[PDB]
Symmetry: D2
Subunit: 468 residues, 4 copies
């Protein structure tokens, strides 16, 4: 029941000023477990406070209100503060006064520096992944001000260019409208998105740009074009003045590291100039396969993905590079080569030779569904596997790469806009002797984009740290 | 233009939020800027929403923030105050004091009834129209608390009905998620939607329900079944104890008033028990035609409505009322009959015998387009007609019904969720001689449902009163 | 290869046509080449159809044309003669005379009953399955004249029913036009379909029809309503005078035999009054699984069926039996429950407890794909499994149920109209160790309907007899 | 009724040998009004004989059988002989013997030459129009042997090229399977389609091909690429050795003639080296507008086309040259610039300045619908306009460019594969004072393709002549 709804609103209204003071004065983003309370409607704060059951026992707004009331005068510097962890492991201390507990558990923060130098991001390409990257980058510059989108690079076409590019960022048939205002300065070739000025750079050669011409230096280029997937090709960006590092939103060929965030971002070194974020399916299934292989062992795995179509395919039957992709995407079920076996082996080198996979592309514009047919080296029960994945999903350090649900009503549309790389549908799970079958949802556009943003911030050094 | 000043703009908005929130709680006042609310919206919409005030007068946030701090002290009643109207006719006036002006432009309210009695709404049916009526009734209850959704009536199917119907309100392939929480209480057969308890009532006969059992009386029933379109049928509802009035979401047959809100809602009298809201197409074009007819003249007019499919139709060819309407809705363009021309002429009898039209149904799930080919009694040029409709849509008494837009690249999905009954695509207007072509978009589901909600509020006597 | 000889090939075929046509008229003989008819087909199909005889033995047209001229003189009866079987085991024999061979391979027929008594078929319902049953019954009446469609039964809607239902049989968004003419006789409530008069009978109660009124007796009813899936319900039909047997186009509940033709149709006895044809998915995969299970062994098996939507579902989210099944069928990928695994195990009880599966519904209107993940009791290689299924599909007793194909670029629309219950995509087969992945296409509407037509012909005693 | 069906079949079976003798011996294609009886099932011959009511009073097969029985020994040379016109205006002579009448009315033909030298056709491009052109060309080489498809030109890609190109001709998601067999000779880069060997030529420069290298000379290049629409560009083909003439399947810019067959093909001269077939909509509406403007006079016309999407558009929102075309075609109604006003003025120079037009692109893969809003210079009645268009459609020399129907059941799917440029839906027609509104269907892929084939045969000199 919700007979208490209006009080819940009323406490959250008390919370907003406090939340926003810590933001503007102390650069402190307040969260409740995974979920932000910053730049957010009162009703969202309610919804997110309900959510805390799904990790803890029972979370009332007052405990948040009281930690916030005692955080306003604690002279804090920048940091992400989880209001919920502070509630739980205060109650499990256990002794008031609250203040005392906070000053202790938020020690490194108190009095720390409230500014960090941001890092310039350039999007090379501005397509489906490119633009969702730009949305996220603009949201997070407003939360954290760590990575600044400064520019996009597109080829010169036909001089209404700029208006269409801004419109493609303002609007999306699938992802709906941009959270903010998008204005265009035609004279200086800039798209303004909220606070952020995005220079549009016209070029046919990734190697002959002087980014310093636009006040860009030391930039991470996120190439979302996919025209170059080998080191020799991606190396073109490093010839452009202003470029420190390159992230490919696609499987990199040869020696290029393929990085699945949460799983092998610790193998990114200071010296790695060129890195790749793998594919959407790779990011969807690799957390899961790694976690299952370490616990139970995977003799063999097949992946079938029932996948949304992408923009390389054709509205109507016509020629195409790949397998059967050139048949009309919106009228057909299409059997397609996935590279996901090979990709999963790159990042988990221990499953080399043990995996096969295949795609079926169907008439939807976003969101996909991996089916993992897994032969284990141990006998397993269904509820034990569900509970161990729910645990990883909700409390492990792959918390943000993996979600777990037991919703009997959700379908592909409901996953549009999810921030996880992979969402295990728990009701579906099958286990029988050594056989496991897992079903994984992913928003292949946005879910993947979020992984790429995380790679970009590790590389830039501006991942926020969460206390405690 | 630019957004060099965006972080400045956020700052102010945020000093507004606690003050907008006082008024709403303490004084039951909703605050707007030329018809855009600032209650239960982000800081970003407050920025957007003061920005679009250049369309109207030709507005700094401080003018609002200066206004607001006068209204926390003023012993105010229940009102929809506009900050925009209040600033314009302060400048273009003899000016200071501020306090003095806001206590004379706002005499009617200062110390008044802060609470009207709400009126109980029953939703008979709970499909595509009914569930959006629910979403609006719920969020307008938070804003104004005039009309309260009390109950839906459906037929008993299984024993898992209640939870399936809660799901249907919580998620939607087109309209996305409910803004709030939906909880189900099985013991009492209640869907909670934010603070709103919605009784589920199960009945095969609209005539044999004592609504007073469930605490409901003098209710308006919004029959969104489509089952009964004549007086006899809809009179069934009046036989049920607790029912005062009936609103049909559809063209009423025979002698039933068909109401297009903004145009002829004043034809509703206190003894009118049963009212009709006409079709989506009628609501979308009647305003535009009347405005065009009053200003230039209409000699002749053709309507082609290019229209989304509706749920009565068929995924794959099968039986239906009409031969063409039952063929695979998602695989065909379907030329079909429209009642619009005859229905437009009911409401505008001055156009009786001057109008024709057809409908073509296409594989989209929501949003339609009316193409209006008008021979006029007068010569027009494209830029002049545009500016006329732009003025009509900003200043006229049909603001809420008519919007006009200049935006490029816009397509049908961008109009999901729009509040206006019809939106004139400025870029598409064609005008040569006495010949005019207008393109009018409409969210046949949500746009139309907002018009239904205005009739309901009108019948019930709770149209918010907007001052001054 | 080439077609340097194509105009030569047409020439011969055309000297066949008048002779194939004699046999059919005079002697009630249908002529085929390894299971492909040459009656009421183009000259081009006769070329195609002698060409695909290299798949089987490893065939000149003259061998056929030489055969034919012997059969115009031979006082022949009613038979489905194969020209292919007759040529192969003439060469690989002691050969001339030709006349002598064809009067000893074809002793059973030479001078026999040229006319069997047909059996009256009633179609109860007339939707997606029923109308394709009609198309098959009509064109098989021209070929064999064993089962005759006599009547459909529908509920009275309007007074333009008859013509709407004639239209539904004449046109189809997926299956294209009826091959023939459909005429309506309103006075007698008859749809003419080529030479076939189909009575339309209107009834709310399957139990209260004297079919003998309309000249129908000892009929098989093919209940394609879906309404009644148990013995009690389907027994209603037997209470109607004129009814002998009932065939349900669906999995029958309880104790009703579920029949997969090619596999267990011999379980039908003369005292079986009510029979079930199982689901599309069951018909598509049961044959393949049994063949794979007999040859290698099945230790474990998972089925994912990627499946077209069906007409019970919803264009746009609304109520349904299942929560997920009622969401917008054309906008979503929908993970849902399948009965297939349990139904496969009914028919193959040797696989009881070794099978699992799920279904995903996608926005296509017809044609589905079963993905079979099989752990086998034996090691297999891709090329060997392929050649096995290829042999099974050409030579085995499940030829009509199983096809195998090597063709590139094939996608779901190319399988509309296919006669086989399931078609193995050769290119997609994956095999490594004991692990096998098979992809089986099926026209869930037309393929399945052909299996229904085989049960019907079997129950009725009119399976064409194919010699020698 | 069809109680006489089997006799109808039986007479047509007598007809087939005769039809085919005249074909193979005399190169004589027999037709009944518009419809061929050659390479066609018996049931088609029936259907086409029914059709003759729709032009005449009552047509029985026997009159066809008897004209054919007396045509077999009349020593005829090549010609198209309409069996129906010969039936009508024999009965309206009137005197037997039949023979005498034929030898007189088929005078020019008797004893004439039975061979004509064919013309080599090259398809530059092999996309949606290209391949339908290839289907038609292969059908008509088998009927008339006037234009021979010899080659396609595609750019060099990635070496599975040839198999995909053959597969794209074999199969089509919308147009279904090819009528014949398609084999590939990989060694000589040939696609065999039935009798016809198609050389695949790989080139990046239309100007540097020696077509004589492949035994091609004096060829009409049908450029269906649309990369070059100006004379300077199309002139590139004339530099290639082997090229006589060029036909652009698109509006040609500048001085290039835009040819709508039936309407201005008489303006093609012996000296015109480069000609264009206009657009699909232009071909759909120009017959109609010309015919209406000559009778009644067109003050002003607007065209709205509700148009299928084409392959230049995007599955999902992305950048694009044109207006709003880059939004996702399968999810949206999209307002688009048509050039059809300008195009219709080119071919009808008399409507210059009097026409506007617009497209709405909707989620269908083929078939479109023009709505013509016409202000006339005369008052008109509805039935008189319907009857005058039905007359033009069925008996004028634009018979094949225009059809007329009064079918209450047909929708866009039913027009796939129509051979007319434009099909007027007569039930829809509106007329009121000086205002006419006409609705025109067209299969924008195939309908247009057929017009282009006709242009190709006029230019080649191999249009067949029909007697009488
Ligand atoms: N664009 C639009 O959709 C649009 C716009 C304007 C007006 N309209 C009109 O609004 C009406 C509702 O349309 P809709 O699209 O919302 O239809 P819908 O989605 O089919 O919803 C209709 C609702 O009414 C219920 N219902 C139907 N027949 C009933 C009966 N005999 N007894 C009780 N309940 C019954 C349904 O029951 P279940 O939930 O059990 O199926 C469902 O809840 C129609 O008259 C339509 O013409 C529609
Ligand atoms: N892929 C497939 O479609 C497929 C394959 C295998 C088996 N099945 C099964 O075959 C059955 C038929 O499915 P379908 O897709 O053909 O359904 P459909 O297209 O809805 O056709 C069902 C037909 O039965 C009629 N009907 C329904 N309820 C009735 C009732 N109470 N009394 C009398 N007639 C009634 C309908 O009447 P109206 O014409 O008046 O609407 C319609 O003629 C279902 O059980 C389904 O599970 C379907
Ligand atoms: N409704 C219709 O589709 C329709 C109707 C009437 C007229 N038209 C016009 O007909 C033309 C063809 O349209 P379509 O729908 O057939 O387009 P399409 O399906 O894209 O076919 C284009 C063909 O031309 C080739 N091509 C494209 N650019 C080329 C280049 N620079 N050099 C060489 N070859 C090139 C393509 O090569 P690949 O195969 O390698 O991709 C393909 O074979 C267009 O101008 C269009 O406006 C279309």
């Amino acid at each position: 029941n919700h007979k208490d709804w209006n009080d819940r609103i009323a406490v959250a209204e008390e919370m907003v000023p406090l939340i926003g003071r810590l933001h503007r004065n102390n650069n402190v983003v307040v969260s409740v477990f995974g979920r932000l309370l910053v730049n957010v409607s009162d009703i969202d704060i309610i919804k997110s406070h309900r959510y805390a059951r799904h990790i803890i026992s029972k979370l009332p707004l007052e405990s948040s209100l009281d930690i916030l009331r005692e955080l306003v005068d604690m002279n804090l510097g920048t940091a992400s503060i989880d209001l919920g962890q502070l509630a739980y492991s205060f109650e499990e201390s256990e002794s008031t006064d609250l203040r005392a507990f906070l000053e202790d558990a938020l020690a490194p923060v108190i009095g720390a520096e409230t500014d960090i130098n941001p890092t310039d991001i350039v999007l090379y390409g501005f397509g489906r992944i490119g633009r969702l990257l730009a949305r996220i980058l603009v949201s997070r510059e407003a939360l954290y001000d760590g990575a600044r989108l400064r520019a996009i690079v597109v080829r010169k076409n036909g001089e209404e260019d700029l208006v269409k590019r801004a419109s493609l960022l303002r609007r999306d048939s699938v992802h709906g409208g941009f959270d903010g205002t998008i204005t265009t300065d035609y004279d200086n070739n800039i798209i303004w998105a909220n606070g952020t000025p995005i220079k549009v750079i016209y070029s046919n050669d990734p190697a002959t740009i002087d980014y310093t011409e636009y006040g860009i230096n030391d930039a991470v280029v996120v190439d979302n074009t996919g025209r170059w997937r080998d080191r020799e090709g991606l190396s073109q960006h490093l010839k452009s003045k202003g470029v420190a590092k390159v992230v490919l939103t696609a499987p990199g060929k040869g020696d290029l590291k393929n990085i699945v965030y949460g799983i092998n971002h610790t193998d990114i070194t200071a010296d790695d100039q060129i890195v790749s974020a793998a594919s959407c399916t790779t990011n969807a299934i690799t957390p899961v396969l790694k976690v299952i292989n370490d616990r139970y062992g995977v003799e063999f795995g097949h992946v079938e993905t029932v996948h949304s179509f992408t923009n390389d395919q054709n509205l109507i039957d016509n020629f195409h590079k790949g397998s059967r992709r050139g048949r009309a995407a919106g009228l057909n079920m299409v059997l397609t080569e996935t590279g996901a076996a090979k990709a999963v082996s790159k990042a988990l080198p221990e499953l080399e030779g043990k995996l096969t996979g295949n795609a079926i592309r169907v008439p939807t514009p976003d969101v996909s569904m991996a089916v993992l047919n897994l032969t284990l080296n141990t006998e397993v029960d269904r509820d034990e596997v569900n509970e161990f994945l729910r645990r990883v999903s909700l409390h492990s350090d792959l918390r943000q790469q993996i979600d777990w649900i037991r919703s009997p009503e959700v379908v592909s549309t409901d996953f549009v806009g999810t921030t996880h790389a992979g969402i295990v549908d728990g009701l579906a799970t099958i286990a029988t002797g050594r056989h496991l079958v897992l079903y994984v949802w992913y928003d292949n556009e946005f879910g993947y984009s979020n992984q790429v943003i995380r790679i970009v911030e590790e590389i830039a050094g501006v991942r926020p740290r969460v206390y405690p």
